[PDB]
Structures are given as structure tokens and as C-alpha cells.
């Protein structure tokens, strides 16, 4: 939670690799994540990510950030109004790229990025249509690169924001991100209206549990490393150092 863009800031831990492979199949896959909130248990269908009762939002981030590559997730969405089946890349300046399924929406999936926390418009956001997300699991993956973000599938693209659209690349994701995947009532009673509406209606938790599942995580890094600093307040991908 420390700005690179306001302070100077402790280095990023790096992924000292070009590949990271987790089948959460094992309870071994946990390693190189922190169950940030909640609980996440290992079942035979992965990670579990279960919206049971307010206030319920497990969570797992990797302990490494990557610097431009990919992140695949192999995701079932979970079911129910307003539970929301988060996917976020994130930086420690906010700069951002996600996947978002509604438990209600039986048909679409949400695209998403944000530059340095700025949530000013919302041309960041297009819905593209998936198959029963909440039903069955897709590959979820996006291409990170310093001309273009582009979002897929099951190998489909189905969306691309190039370093121009993104404000002229004032606003494209370009500081080293780390992997966040939850689960979380956006239909919260205690959440905005706005959210409410978003998320597809309030969430009934008795009605739950709403479980999403993530069986599989691959993270190619395109610039592998021990850990990256800002060296100064420009947010620039061209301010990252590492050795």
C-alpha cells in the first residue's frame, strides 16, 4: 500500500523466473501466495474462494510481482446475485487489469484497467460474452505488453487496449504488477448503490455459499528478476529498475 507515485518506496519482490506454474490440485500450490483475507482451502477442483457470509472475501496475491509477460487463470465463476469472481493484476502505484464474472450474469464477463488509480472515466470497462462463467471453467488470460494489454479467452481475444488508447499512455498498466484472485459480495447491503447495481443486485448469503475456483495459475515474466524499484515519481514502466 505504499505510492511509488507520492514516496519513495521499498523494492518490489521480483519473479526471479520467465515462468510460474501452480495446478492447485496440491496444497503444496499455496507457496509462493499470501490468503490475504479469508480462508482459501485446496480441493480437488483447486483454490475455493467461498462467499458464505457478510464480510466474506477470500483472497490469495502472489508474494512476487511480474514486470509485462502473461497471466493465465483457469476459473469457475461463483453463482449468486451480486458475488463477484475477481482476477486483478496490480501495481503498488494502482495500475491495474482485471476480470471480473457477476454470479447472476450468466453470460458475460467484465474487462477492466485502471492507470495509477485513476478511476476518473469508465471507458476502462467492456462486458464480452463467456459461456455459463459461473458453470464451468475458462482460461482467463492476459497479455501484457508495453505497445498493448490484450485480454483472451480460451485462446479468443476478445479485447485489446494499445499504450495510445490508454490516455496516450498516461494511463496504461505499466509498473510491475502482482496476481490477486478473490471472491466478494459486491451486492454487500453495506456496499454504494452503484456497486449494488454493478455487481447484478444485493447478495442473499443464506442463500449461499457461493464458491468460485481457480484450478490453475500461469504467470510468464517478461523481465525476470529479484525485485524492482521506482526510481522516481513518474510511474513510467521506463522508472523500474532491476538488476
Not at 456496499?191 to 475456483?213: H, V
Request: negative net charge; glycine residues 10%; charged residues 20%.
Amino acid at each position: 500500500k505504499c505510492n511509488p507515485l507520492e514516496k519513495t518506496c521499498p523494492p518490489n519482490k521480483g519473479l526471479a523466473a520467465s515462468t510460474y506454474t501452480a495446478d492447485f490440485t496440491s496444497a503444496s500450490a499455496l507457496d509462493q501466495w499470501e490468503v490475504t483475507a479469508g480462508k482459501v482451502p485446496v480441493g480437488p477442483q483447486g483454490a475455493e474462494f467461498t462467499v458464505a457470509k457478510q464480510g466474506d472475501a477470500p483472497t490469495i496475491d502472489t508474494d512476487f510481482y511480474f514486470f509485462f509477460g502473461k497471466a493465465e487463470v483457469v476459473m469457475k465463476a461463483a453463482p449468486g446475485t451480486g458475488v463477484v469472481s475477481s482476477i486483478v493484476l496490480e501495481s503498488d502505484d494502482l495500475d491495474e487489469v482485471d476480470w471480473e464474472v457477476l454470479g447472476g450474469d450468466t453470460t458475460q464477463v467484465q474487462t477492466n484497467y485502471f492507470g495509477k488509480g485513476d478511476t476518473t472515466t469508465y471507458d476502462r470497462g467492456t462486458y464480452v460474452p463467456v459461456a455459463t462463467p459461473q458453470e464451468t471453467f475458462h482460461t482467463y488470460t492476459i497479455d501484457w505488453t508495453k505497445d498493448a494489454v490484450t485480454w483472451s479467452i480460451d485462446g479468443a481475444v476478445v479485447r485489446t487496449l494499445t499504450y495510445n488508447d490508454a490516455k496516450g499512455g498516461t494511463r496504461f498498466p505499466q509498473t510491475p504488477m502482482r496476481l490477486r484472485l478473490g471472491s466478494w459480495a459486491g451486492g454487500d447491503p453495506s456496499n454504494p448503490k452503484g456497486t449494488i447495481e454493478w455487481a447484478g443486485g444485493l447478495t442473499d448469503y443464506s442463500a449461499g455459499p457461493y464458491t468460485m475456483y481457480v484450478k490453475s495459475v500461469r504467470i510468464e515474466n517478461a523481465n525476470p528478476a529479484e525485485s524492482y524499484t521506482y526510481s522516481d515519481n513518474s510511474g513510467s514502466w521506463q522508472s523500474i529498475k532491476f538488476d
